[PDB]
Symmetry: none
Amino acid sequence: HMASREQTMENILKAAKKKFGERGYEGTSIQEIAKEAKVNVAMASYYFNGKENLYYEVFKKYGLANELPNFLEKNQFNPINALREYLTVFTTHIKENPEIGTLAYEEIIKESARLEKIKPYFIGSFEQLKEILQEGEKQGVFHFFSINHTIHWITSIVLFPKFKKFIDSADLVSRIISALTDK
Amino acid sequence: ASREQTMENILKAAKKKFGERGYEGTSIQEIAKEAKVNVAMASYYFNGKENLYYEVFKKYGLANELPNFLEKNQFNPINALREYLTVFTTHIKENPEIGTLAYEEIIKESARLEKIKPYFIGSFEQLKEILQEGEKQGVFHFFSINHTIHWITSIVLFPKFDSADLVSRIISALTDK
């Protein structure tokens, strides 16, 4: 018989992930999301009350289940291993959730009012990169001209939703580390 | 060493050191040391760090502004992007430090931009129009123009990350629907 409330909301979130991923936050409306979800706009607005909250719920559903552990501490301040773990977790997440790559990239490069609320669901843990790189540089293992340029370089490649069509994930992780460890 | 051989040594040294640390991370002192010349001799030939930087772009950048790749390729965005990527990857392979420095300036805009622009970044910026025309014509498929510009920028320019496989692998990632 009838769909459950949980199923309909899930359908709407799948739709919103898809549509937000295609057209960005600004380029997407609740009307197109409802249409994609095959639900009445009224029902979609009853459950989520607007695209802002729907966007938040997208990051919550398809971002990280939990804040990630500190990779440097987890790897006992072995910077190469910390970075391998960091890169493995994130490239794997983006492989499974390409839209989060696109959306997180946009929020990283252009700070919006939404940042503070969505941060725990992806960007907060993604920001561990800086300390990993500084540690590796400090330990004489990573070599790069600028920390911020290296952060932007990795952010751009790791979050790109179609990276798997250019390069395997495990290879991407290896190649990123190699580029840093080359003296 | 002749005047010309000495200038050559200074430019090679400048390319190297700038390539390692970027503009602000390098000094004329350490350039002149790498070149095995006296600092005043570096100044005689190049009038300082900023002009030496300009001269590095002049020597190891593009000789001329590149032609509009879309026009040249009858608005075939796949052929336009192939030609763009080929000229740029070939240039970067010969002088990889220029990729590093162009990346530095692209990601973090400085007061140096307008002087160095036509030696690399100016022609490099055709990327946006090429991708947008490909998207308009149904032959490129991507979610964010800006992310895609930055993704390609990162692959092409950023140092130390099979060239033949490269151009076609980039294009293949875009032509996929």
